[PDB]
Design an enzyme around this catalytic site. Sequence first.
Site, PDB file in Angstrom:
ATOM      1  N   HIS A 123      -5.365   4.948  -0.781  1.00 61.89           N
ATOM      2  CA  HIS A 123      -4.229   3.902  -1.143  1.00 61.89           C
ATOM      3  C   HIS A 123      -3.900   3.188  -2.790  1.00 61.89           C
ATOM      4  O   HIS A 123      -5.043   3.353  -3.042  1.00 61.89           O
ATOM      5  CB  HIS A 123      -4.294   3.237  -0.347  1.00 61.89           C
ATOM      6  CG  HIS A 123      -4.160   3.985   1.325  1.00 61.89           C
ATOM      7  ND1 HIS A 123      -3.149   3.745   1.888  1.00 61.89           N
ATOM      8  CD2 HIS A 123      -5.129   4.547   2.415  1.00 61.89           C
ATOM      9  CE1 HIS A 123      -2.981   4.524   3.428  1.00 61.89           C
ATOM     10  NE2 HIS A 123      -4.371   4.735   3.550  1.00 61.89           N
ATOM     11  N   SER A 126      -7.152   8.649   5.810  1.00 59.55           N
ATOM     12  CA  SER A 126      -6.688   9.817   5.996  1.00 59.55           C
ATOM     13  C   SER A 126      -6.047  10.210   4.426  1.00 59.55           C
ATOM     14  O   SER A 126      -5.769  11.445   4.130  1.00 59.55           O
ATOM     15  CB  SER A 126      -5.669   9.631   6.530  1.00 59.55           C
ATOM     16  OG  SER A 126      -4.324  10.708   6.418  1.00 59.55           O
ATOM     17  N   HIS A 158       0.509  -1.340   0.379  1.00 60.60           N
ATOM     18  CA  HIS A 158       0.043   0.137  -0.432  1.00 60.60           C
ATOM     19  C   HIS A 158       0.725   1.153   0.356  1.00 60.60           C
ATOM     20  O   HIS A 158       1.660   1.624   1.236  1.00 60.60           O
ATOM     21  CB  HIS A 158      -0.705  -0.295   1.315  1.00 60.60           C
ATOM     22  CG  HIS A 158      -0.642   0.143   2.450  1.00 60.60           C
ATOM     23  ND1 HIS A 158      -1.123   0.154   3.757  1.00 60.60           N
ATOM     24  CD2 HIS A 158       0.958  -0.151   3.328  1.00 60.60           C
ATOM     25  CE1 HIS A 158      -0.559   0.002   5.004  1.00 60.60           C
ATOM     26  NE2 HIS A 158       0.441   0.239   4.128  1.00 60.60           N
ATOM     27  N   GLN A 175      -8.284  -1.625   6.823  1.00 57.02           N
ATOM     28  CA  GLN A 175      -9.373   0.069   6.690  1.00 57.02           C
ATOM     29  C   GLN A 175     -10.580  -0.810   5.297  1.00 57.02           C
ATOM     30  O   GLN A 175     -10.321  -1.748   5.020  1.00 57.02           O
ATOM     31  CB  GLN A 175      -9.231   1.226   6.253  1.00 57.02           C
ATOM     32  CG  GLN A 175      -7.556   1.136   6.969  1.00 57.02           C
ATOM     33  CD  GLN A 175      -6.871   2.306   6.557  1.00 57.02           C
ATOM     34  OE1 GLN A 175      -6.806   2.724   5.090  1.00 57.02           O
ATOM     35  NE2 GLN A 175      -6.155   2.396   7.096  1.00 57.02           N
ATOM     36  N   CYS A 215       2.199   7.413   4.253  1.00 54.07           N
ATOM     37  CA  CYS A 215       1.545   6.477   5.387  1.00 54.07           C
ATOM     38  C   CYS A 215       3.518   5.930   5.817  1.00 54.07           C
ATOM     39  O   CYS A 215       4.146   5.880   5.354  1.00 54.07           O
ATOM     40  CB  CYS A 215       0.851   5.776   4.886  1.00 54.07           C
ATOM     41  SG  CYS A 215       0.431   4.237   6.776  1.00 54.07           S
TER      42      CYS A 215
END
Length: 117
Positions: A111, A108, A13, A85, A67
């Site tokens: 991805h 957030s 990711h 998620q 991230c």
Amino acid sequence: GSHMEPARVRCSHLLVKHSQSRRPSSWRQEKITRTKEEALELINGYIQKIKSGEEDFESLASQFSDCSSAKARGDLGAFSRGQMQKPFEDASFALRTGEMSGPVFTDSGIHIILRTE
């Protein structure tokens, strides 16, 4: 045909956040100035770069990922649903080995999901 559903899958990711986010503070940038428009274009670009075989996803995820995914080179390891998620989960389990989804708008930010298994 119908192959037995794997208990655990793994996804690489990459996360590109946006200035207006729940947390625009990351390991690289303490503050993110790039807007949603930028985030989207970055993701779109990276996707095309992965498709053209420009740079390795690991390299990209270790650089252009807000991230803390760089620690594992972008790899999440073998995980299962319910602990991931939600927008990412249904996306990962909608792909297969060697498949990559598009801009996954998550909590957030966006991805990129590349499954190696």
